[PDB]
């Protein structure tokens, strides 16, 4: 969260199988856009 940046946090979301990103997709506002391609897909 707060402390954790985008570039980093966006690294975690990189070891998740695409379909999984649908779960994270709704955790919280921020997490949503992040799920949208920035490096993923």
Partner 1 sequence: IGLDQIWDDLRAGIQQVYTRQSMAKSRYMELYTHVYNYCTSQFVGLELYKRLKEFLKNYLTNLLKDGEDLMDESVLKFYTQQWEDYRFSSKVLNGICAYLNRHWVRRECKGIYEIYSLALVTWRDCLFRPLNKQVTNAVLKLIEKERNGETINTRLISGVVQSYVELGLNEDLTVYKESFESQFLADTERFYTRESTEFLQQNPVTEYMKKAEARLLEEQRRVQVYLHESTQDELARKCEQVLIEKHLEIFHTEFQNLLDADKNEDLGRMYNLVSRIQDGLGELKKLLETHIHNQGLAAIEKCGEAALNDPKMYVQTVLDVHKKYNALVMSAFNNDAGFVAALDKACGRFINNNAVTK
Partner 2 sequence: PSIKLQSSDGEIFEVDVEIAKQSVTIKTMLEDLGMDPVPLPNVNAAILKKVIQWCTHHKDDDIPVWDQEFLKVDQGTLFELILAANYLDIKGLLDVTCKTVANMIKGKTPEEIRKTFN
**Which residues bind to partner 1, rule: CB under 8 A?**
5-7, 10, 38
Nearer to partner 2, 28 or 37 (CB): 28
- 32's CB contacts (< 8 A; 6+ apart) are 25, 26
Calpha distance 1→7 (Å, rounded): 12
SS3 30: helix
Q: Quick check: 18 binds partner 2 (CB under 8 A)?
A: no
Nearer to partner 1, 14 or 19 (CB): 14
- Give residues in contact with partner 2 (CB under 8 A): 1, 3-5, 8-9, 11-13, 15-16, 20, 23-24, 26-28
């Amino acid at each position: 969260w707060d402390s954790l940046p985008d570039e980093l946090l966006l690294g975690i979301f990189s070891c998740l199988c695409l379909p999984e990103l649908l779960k994270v997709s709704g955790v919280c506002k921020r997490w949503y856009r992040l799920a949208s391609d920035e490096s993923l897909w």
